[PDB]
Structures are given as structure tokens and as C-alpha cells.
Design a protein around this ligand. Structure first.
Ligand SMILES: Nc1ncnc2c1ncn2[C@@H]1O[C@H](COP(=O)(O)OP(=O)(O)O)[C@@H](O)[C@H]1O
Ligand SMILES: Nc1ncnc2c1ncn2[C@@H]1O[C@H](COP(=O)(O)OP(=O)(O)O)[C@@H](O)[C@H]1O
Ligand SMILES: Nc1ncnc2c1ncn2[C@@H]1O[C@H](COP(=O)(O)OP(=O)(O)O)[C@@H](O)[C@H]1O
Lengths: 735, 239
């Protein structure tokens, strides 16, 4: 038994002496809330930390940060021994000194700038011989214990004096640098990063297991994403956290060699990593190495591609090397590389969402000190087209602005800077706004994927439609047991038709938010570009991106916008079928029905929609969104007024009754006009900060009905023709 | 404190001995409109100029032209020391001669063509050892002081006689050529040029600051524009 062995895993808190344990873990080992333990690992070394309460990690695993993982020489997946230590122990004299690998540039006091704001009111239990890292001064510097009283009996106390000599010492090869790349340095990638964690955990941490079994290990991992997403960061972090010898192979570095030298350089890079097993061979750019799809210009290019292909599939076990290649675009790769044995496991790393970029900002700003009025929530929202490298550049530029506001008048003309100035240099929002306005996003044209923040509370009315949407996309994904028993497959998608500006997009986004799945949206111009550009082959890429991002919903806005541009029911001498809808149907028919992917079709002119899409099998479920009723319009305003401060004066119920033929869009622009009037009257009166009732009274003058009465009749007759519930309404069984 | 340190910046006027200062800058240092100062920089050298009134530059910076920046061996972003000099000082005999790097092609009188239309009705305070540049004759030729009365006490006066030998002298590597490319030689580019000024001011003027910090410096700047816009001019001027 020996219930003291726990699985080491990454922590969540950014502190130093923190251990995250579940309630039953301390309840089994008679451990309390505010106690200390003694973690013991390999190489005859121990560590003293503080246990904390957790409820998310696991049942029998320990969450330990990178700062303390390097102290015990224990990586992820290894096992350690934990035991309580209720013995009283105080600190008297702690002597520490940093290592010269990171102190080059520090001048002045070292206690007041790094130790005082870290050791006081913390009661961090230090251990003689441990390496702890502290952050501050827009950098990261650690410290090393060289001589102290024999451990245990080392706990920082307010009445403990600290003195240091001043010169640093050199480190050894036993410990790794804390400034390197780790799992805690990656943000905005959780679904993709977890797959890579679980994919290479066995062959790297346990190389001897695969040598004794017939299981084929994954020999190739291809990474996607626009340049700057962080593929190299993830590749280096996996190697640095799994104990594998990382070997970086740059793209242009090999191609820059002469004729025949590139072959030797690429070939010598494989057995070198094979000897240092386990190892990970990473390729920076692979589209620039093997673009053997359309280029095929030059014998040396083909020779390099063939050499790479030969060295790729020729890894018949031997070592335990895993090759992870990175590229920019999936189609820009040689198809011969995707053969089974060279590159079979495929990983697509997308642009982080709003909740992902905040983690990147927290990672990139953890070394510097910010002011109280600095919030990263608005920065992530305002930066919705940027990538991982974009935000690091934004942070660097924002940090540079603060230096410019103090270097000019202080004029520290010294060979090295002091640590007592940079700590006080707090970056404010004004520094970030200057850099945000000039940073050009590198990721704007390709489709962005989210899991939208809009929920059911933002949608007013449409209660009949909500239950229907929560009936076909949430039941097969949560309770499939009642589906395979009947032997019938679920629906492939549902089409939305009705008057424009009623919520055709809000329902699709809310159903994605509730189901916790990705959301891909295609607008009208996006569909029209591939028609006018005479290139309909881009549907396959959209469907592939949706498939491997499962679960996800495939939303097509105004699907009839391609038939409206060429007439409609009659139009020109052609019919109601074109190349883009052709390719969409072709890719939907061959789409995997067992996957969690879903397709949402939105249209405002259902009379011109091709019937070929509407058969049972592609899009059979049709839900009509009518104009909001009296109590449906009230909820629209109750949901739209949650952002702007409006007092109790404005009567929303009375406004809904007068707005009879008003769609959802008109009620939004009414509030927009009222708030614009409020802003204008505030600015004009500045030469008050609340929305009054006469604002809406004047804004109601220009209340234009976007939907007239002529199309209402057409929509209603179309709905009743497609429903056809008459005749069989009184159909009953005799006995 | 020591309120005598000012930030050196480019000037606006195309004159020679002109210092642009704000009203509070002279109001703090008890300096008037028509007075002279003594600018001191690095390498144990000084410079005498005339302060002027300005209202646009800054609160605590000094605007100094390229002609006087090379005299003190001070570039943009550096700091200097300014102090008033109300002592009376007149000129008696100023001996100057140009450098052969730019005089190849000049023949005849040198005073009437370059010094007379520059020194008269100007009262420019010269300093022994300074290199001042004058424009004229569809070119630019400067002059060098080789031997004169020990500075101070060098101010051009109408009753001051000037004679010159005629042969020039060679320059050294301490000073830079005034015919080179500078910030004053770029025109029509203010928004773009300011971004490049502020982008590389830190890593170039203070190389040791980035070596002691984790901030990533900009390693690459791409320039656009149709051929002939002046990208090479800006690139050479920044360096
Ligand atoms: N998801 C991320 N989390 C944290 N940092 C990131 C992320 N993505 C990129 N970065 C930062 O951007 C910098 C540049 O990354 P880069 O080498 O361009 O990645 P790639 O090689 O995948 O394009 C790195 O130093 C890294 O710190
Ligand atoms: N039922 C509704 N409840 C609340 N707001 C709505 C509703 N329908 C539309 N809106 C608002 O109208 C705006 C535009 O909607 P739009 O995308 O044109 O709808 P559709 O896709 O049905 O045409 C959205 O920002 C949304 O906030
Ligand atoms: N904005 C400018 N201000 C002053 N001179 C300019 C400017 N742009 C170009 N010139 C002049 O034009 C000449 C040729 O410039 P050129 O070398 O063609 O620039 P680039 O290499 O950027 O095309 C230079 O000698 C320079 O003096």
C-alpha cells in the first residue's frame, strides 16, 4: 500500500511554496489546512512546502509548480514521497546568494528590492540547498543557499536577520535553468496542449516500456497555426518538461547550405539525437523545406525532400526519438509526408480567444510590476485579431514606453542599471494604449474560432425555439445510449429561415455556448468571394478545420446571398445551383455522422434556397423565427439594457406595445440612437452621467421598421406551406 | 538637483549660434532675452552661443543645431551643462582657416564671399577651437580656429580685423564631417520619422541598458515608399 506516493503534476497558483491537495487526500493522511510537509524526491534530496486546499486536480495526485519541481529534480509523471512534519522549526540566520547566470545587470541593494517584498508576511519555509525563483524588476532572478544551519529548522520569521556577501556562484549541470521554457509559460492553449501532453507522455517518460511491447509509438506530430501562435514554444516546453534532448532544426538554416552540404547537415542531425535518447527533433518551418506540391523547381530541392522522407520513415524503432514538425498552412505541405509512418498524428493550434489571451498577458507581465488601474480584461477584448507573438510584442512595446518617460530626466549614464529603479517603474494603462493603437495584427483574414460569450439571457423571447435547439444538439452529445439502441442516426443540421434581424446568429452562438463547443461563422461575402474568385475548393479547408476542432458548429450566415447576387428563383438562364453550394453539399454528404460537428444554416429568402439541400440527410430540420410578440420584445430590451446604465424612468413595457411591426434589429438601433444622444448631450454640456427618459422619447422619432408588411405575408405563407399540418390534425386510432 | 542639465534636441532655426529655450527655463535660471551663455559638453570642451525665446520644444530640454552639436561632440539624447556668462568680452583678432576636405574649388577672396555676409550685423560669439559651417556659393564650406587669444573673450565686432594665410589644414577623426547626412537634411517626413527616432533611441544611445534587462529590442525595421522617397537618407541620418 504505502499511501504516501503521489503523482506530480503542474500547479495553478503562481506562488512558490504551495501544494494543491484535495479534501480526501488530507483527510486520509490526518493533515490540516495550515500545516507544512516535507516533500522527498530522487537523488537524496528533500523539500519543505505548504499544503493548500484544492477541489479540481485529482484523487491521488499532487500539483507542484515549476519552481519547486526543479528543486527535487522531479518532472511531470514521476512519483514522490510526502510525509507530514508537525515539528516546530524556526529560522535564525539564512545565508543566500544568486547565480551569475541572471544577475548581470543588478546593482545596489538586493534585500529591499527582491527579498523584502517576497519574504515578509509570507512565512515561506525555506530549505538549505533549494533554488527558489523570485520575480521583480521586469526580470526574474533566483537565489541559492550555500551554507546555513542543517535542515530542517529553516522558516522565515519577521525577527530573522539576513546578510549577503555580494559575489555570485556558478551553477552545475544537475539543475536546469529556471529562465528556460516550461509548461507554465504556455497560455491560451489547453485543448491542443493536453493532446500533446498525453500523446508523448509514455514514450518519453517510459522509453523502456515501448521497447518491451509491440505498440507502435507516434513517430511524427505535425503542428499548425499562423506564424507566431507558439508552436516552437510548445515543442521546446514538451522536451524541457519530459527530460528529452531537444534538437532545433531551422527551416532556412538547412536550405542555406550549398549543394550536398544540406544533405549532410540534415542527416547528421538524426543519429546525433538518436544517441541522446530520448530526444525530440523539431523542425521550425516545414513548408519552406518540402513544398513539393506545386513548386518542383530544381534537383536539389527534390533531393532534400526525398532525403527528409527517407530519414523520416526509416526510423525503425532503434532510438525513442519523436519528430515534431511545424508549419503555417495545412495545404502547403507535401502529401507524401502525411503517409502512415511519417506524419500521422495531426495537431492544429488556433488563435487564442478572449479568455486565452488574458493568460498570455499574465505570463508575459509576471516579471514586471503594474499599477492598480491596470486590467488585462479590456486588453484581451480590444485585441481580438492578435496571436501569441503579437501580445508579447505589445507587452514589450508597452514596457518600453514607461522607460522613455523616465530615462530622459534621470540620465543614469552607467555601464549597468540599478534594481532600485525598475521596480518602481510601474506600467500604466496609458503606456499600454499607445502600443495597442500601433500594433498590427498578423491574423485577420483566416476564420477565427471561439466558444462565444453570449448566453440564453442575452436572447429576448423565442422560448419555443430554445427548447427545440436544446433538443437535437445536446441529447445525442450527452445521452447517446438511447440513440444507438434504436439504430437511427441523429440529424446532421438545422436551417434557420425568417425575416432578417430576428436572432438567426444569436441562437447559433447561444447553442454553441451552452454546449461548450467551438463556433465557426461564415458570412455572406465569405461565401461570395469563392464564387466571384472562381475558386470553390476552399470549402474543404473550412470543413476540415471544423472537423478536427470537434465539438463545433458550422454556421453559414445568409446562405442565399449567393443566389441573390445572380437573380433568384429565375434570375439568368441558369437555375438555383452553383459551384459553392455544390461543394458545400459534396462535403456535407461525405461528412462523418458520428462526430460532434454540427452545421447551422441561416437564410432570409427561403424561397430561393435550393431544395437539394433540404432533403432528409443534409438539412431536414427547419425552424422558423417569427417576429417577436408583446412579451418577446420586453425581454429583448431587458437584455440589451444590461450594458448601458439606464434608470427606472424609461418604461420598457410601454415601448414594446407601440412597436408592433419591429424586428430585433430595430430595437437595437433605437437604443444605440438613444445612447448616442446621451453621449452627445454629455459632451456638449461638458463645456448628467445617466440615461434620462427624454433620450428614448427623441430617439423613437426615427424608429424605422426594417421589415415592411409585404414580406410578412410571404414568410407566413411559406411557413404554412412547408409545415402542412392541416388535414391530419384530427387523425385518431380506432382501437 | 543641479538645475543646469538639459536634454539636447534638434533645433528649428537655420542659424548658427541659436539656442531655443522656453520662458520658464530662462525664468528659473535668471536669464534674459538678449544674453549669451557657455555650453559645456564632454571631452573637456565648451561652446558659446546665444539663447533665444521658444514656446514649443519642451519644459526641460535644449534645442541645438547640427552645426553646434558637432562642436561639443554631443549627439541627440545626451545631456550637457548650461551656465550663464554675463562677463563682458570683445574680439580683437580672430584667425581662422578652412579644412581642405571641402575647399577644393575655391579661388580668390575668402572674406568678402563667405565671412563678410556672415559675420557682419550678426554679432555671433565665436569660440577658439570651434568648427562653424557657413553656406554660400552653391556649396557649403566651414572654417577652423587654429590659434587665437585664449577663450573666452572672442566676440565678432565691426571694428575687428581679419586676416588669413591661405593654406588649409587636415582634420582628425574626433569630429565628423558637416557635409554628411543629419536629421536636419530630411524634410517632408515627420510622423514616420518620429516613430523611427523613438524606436531606436534606447538600444543605440544606451546599449548597456538592454543588456541588463529582459526587454526584447526591435531587431528589424522595414521601410516602404516608391523609389526616391528618401529611405536611404533616413537610414543614414539615424546612424
Ligand atoms: N500561447 C503562448 N503563450 C505564451 N507565450 C507565447 C504564446 N505564443 C507565443 N508566445 C511568445 O511569442 C514569442 C515568439 O514565438 P514564436 O517563436 O514566433 O512561435 P512560433 O515559432 O510557434 O511562431 C515566444 O517568445 C513566446 O514567449
Ligand atoms: N431576439 C433577440 N433578442 C435580443 N437581441 C436581438 C435579437 N435578435 C437580434 N438581436 C440584436 O440584433 C443585432 C443584429 O442581429 P442579426 O445578426 O442581424 O440577427 P439575424 O442574424 O437574425 O439577422 C444583434 O447584435 C442582436 O443583439
Ligand atoms: N525627404 C527628403 N528630404 C530631403 N532630401 C531628400 C528626401 N528624399 C530624397 N532626398 C534626396 O534625394 C536624393 C536621392 O535619394 P535616394 O537615394 O533615391 O533615396 P532612396 O534610396 O530612399 O530612394 C538624396 O541625395 C536626398 O538628398
Amino acid at each position: 500500500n504505502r499511501p504516501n506516493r503521489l503523482i506530480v503534476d503542474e500547479a495553478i497558483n503562481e506562488d512558490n511554496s504551495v501544494v494543491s491537495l484535495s479534501q480526501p487526500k488530507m483527510d486520509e493522511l490526518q493533515l490540516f489546512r495550515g500545516d507544512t510537509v516535507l516533500l522527498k524526491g530522487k537523488k537524496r534530496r528533500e523539500a519543505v512546502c505548504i499544503v493548500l486546499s484544492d477541489d479540481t486536480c485529482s484523487d491521488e495526485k499532487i500539483r507542484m509548480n515549476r519552481v519547486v519541481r526543479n528543486n527535487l529534480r522531479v518532472r511531470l509523471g514521476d512519483v514522490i514521497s510526502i510525509q507530514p512534519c508537525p515539528d516546530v522549526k524556526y529560522g535564525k540566520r539564512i545565508h543566500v546568494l544568486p547565480i551569475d547566470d541572471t544577475v548581470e545587470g543588478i546593482t545596489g541593494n538586493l534585500f529591499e528590492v527582491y527579498l523584502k517584498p517576497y519574504f515578509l508576511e509570507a512565512y515561506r519555509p525555506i530549505r538549505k540547498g533549494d533554488i527558489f525563483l523570485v520575480r521583480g524588476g521586469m526580470r526574474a532572478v533566483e537565489f541559492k543557499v550555500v551554507e546555513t544551519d542543517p535542515s530542517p529548522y529553516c522558516i522565515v520569521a519577521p525577527d530573522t536577520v539576513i546578510h549577503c556577501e555580494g559575489e555570485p556562484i556558478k551553477r552545475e549541470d544537475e539543475e536546469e535553468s529556471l529562465n528556460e521554457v516550461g509548461y507554465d509559460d504556455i497560455g491560451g492553449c489547453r485543448k491542443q496542449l493536453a493532446q500533446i501532453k498525453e500523446m508523448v507522455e509514455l514514450p518519453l517518460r517510459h522509453p523502456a516500456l515501448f521497447k518491451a511491447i509491440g505498440v507502435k509509438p507516434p513517430r511524427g506530430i505535425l503542428l499548425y497555426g499562423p506564424p507566431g501562435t507558439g508552436k516552437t514554444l510548445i515543442a521546446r516546453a514538451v522536451a524541457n518538461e519530459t527530460g528529452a534532448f531537444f534538437f532545433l532544426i531551422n527551416g532556412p538554416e538547412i536550405m542555406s547550405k550549398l549543394a550536398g552540404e544540406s544533405e549532410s547537415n540534415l542527416r547528421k542531425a538524426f543519429e546525433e539525437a538518436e544517441k541522446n535518447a530520448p530526444a525530440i527533433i523539431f523542425i521550425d518551418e516545414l513548408d519552406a523545406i518540402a513544398p513539393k506540391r506545386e513548386k518542383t523547381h530544381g534537383e536539389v530541392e527534390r533531393r532534400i525532400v526525398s532525403q527528409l522522407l527517407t530519414l523520416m520513415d526509416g526510423l525503425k524503432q532503434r532510438a525513442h526519438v519523436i519528430v515534431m514538425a511545424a508549419t503555417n498552412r495545412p495545404n502547403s505541405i507535401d502529401p507524401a509526408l502525411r503517409r502512415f509512418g511519417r506524419f500521422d498524428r495531426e495537431v492544429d493550434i488556433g488563435i487564442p480567444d478572449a479568455t486565452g489571451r488574458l493568460e498570455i498577458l499574465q505570463i508575459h507581465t509576471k516579471n514586471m510590476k503594474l499599477a492598480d488601474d491596470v486590467d488585462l480584461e479590456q486588453v484581451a477584448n480590444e485585441t481580438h485579431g492578435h496571436v501569441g507573438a503579437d501580445l508579447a510584442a505589445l507587452c514589450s512595446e508597452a514596457a518600453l514606453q514607461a522607460i522613455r518617460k523616465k530615462m530622459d530626466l534621470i540620465d543614469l549614464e552607467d555601464e549597468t542599471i540599478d534594481a532600485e529603479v525598475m521596480n518602481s517603474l510601474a506600467v500604466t494603462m496609458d503606456d499600454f494604449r499607445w502600443a495597442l493603437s500601433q500594433s498590427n495584427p498578423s491574423a485577420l483574414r483566416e476564420t477565427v474560432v471561439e466558444v462565444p460569450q453570449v448566453t440564453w439571457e442575452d436572447i429576448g423571447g423565442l422560448e419555443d425555439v430554445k427548447r427545440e435547439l436544446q433538443e437535437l444538439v445536446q441529447y445525442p452529445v450527452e445521452h447517446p445510449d438511447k440513440f444507438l439502441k434504436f439504430g437511427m442516426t441523429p440529424s446532421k443540421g438545422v436551417l434557420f429561415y425568417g425575416p432578417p434581424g430576428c436572432g438567426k446568429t444569436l441562437l447559433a452562438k447561444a447553442i454553441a455556448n451552452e454546449c461548450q463547443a467551438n463556433f465557426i461563422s461564415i458570412k455572406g461575402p465569405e461565401l461570395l468571394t469563392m464564387w466571384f474568385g472562381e475558386s470553390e475548393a476552399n470549402v474543404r479547408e473550412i470543413f476540415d478545420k471544423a472537423r478536427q476542432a470537434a465539438p463545433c458548429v458550422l454556421f453559414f450566415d445568409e446562405l442565399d446571398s449567393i443566389a441573390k447576387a445572380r437573380g433568384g428563383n429565375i434570375g439568368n438562364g441558369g437555375g438555383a445551383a452553383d459551384r459553392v453550394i455544390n461543394q458545400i453539399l459534396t462535403e456535407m454528404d461525405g461528412m462523418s455522422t458520428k462526430k460532434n460537428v454540427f452545421i447551422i444554416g441561416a437564410t432570409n429568402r427561403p424561397d430561393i434556397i435550393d431544395p437539394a439541400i433540404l432533403r432528409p440527410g443534409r438539412l431536414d430540420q427547419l425552424i422558423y423565427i417569427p417576429l417577436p410578440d408583446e412579451k418577446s420584445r420586453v425581454a429583448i430590451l431587458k437584455a440589451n439594457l444590461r450594458k448601458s446604465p439606464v434608470a427606472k424612468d424609461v418604461d420598457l413595457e410601454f415601448l414594446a406595445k407601440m412597436t408592433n411591426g419591429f424586428s430585433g434589429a430595430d430595437l437595437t438601433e433605437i437604443c444605440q440612437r438613444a445612447c448616442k444622444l446621451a453621449i452627445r448631450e454629455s459632451i456638449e454640456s461638458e463645456i448628467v452621467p445617466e440615461i434620462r427618459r427624454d433620450h428614448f422619447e427623441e430617439a423613437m422619432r426615427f424608429a424605422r421598421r426594417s421589415v415592411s408588411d409585404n414580406d410578412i405575408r410571404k414568410y407566413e405563407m411559406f411557413a404554412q406551406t412547408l409545415q402542412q399540418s392541416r388535414g391530419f390534425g384530427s387523425f385518431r386510432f380506432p382501437s
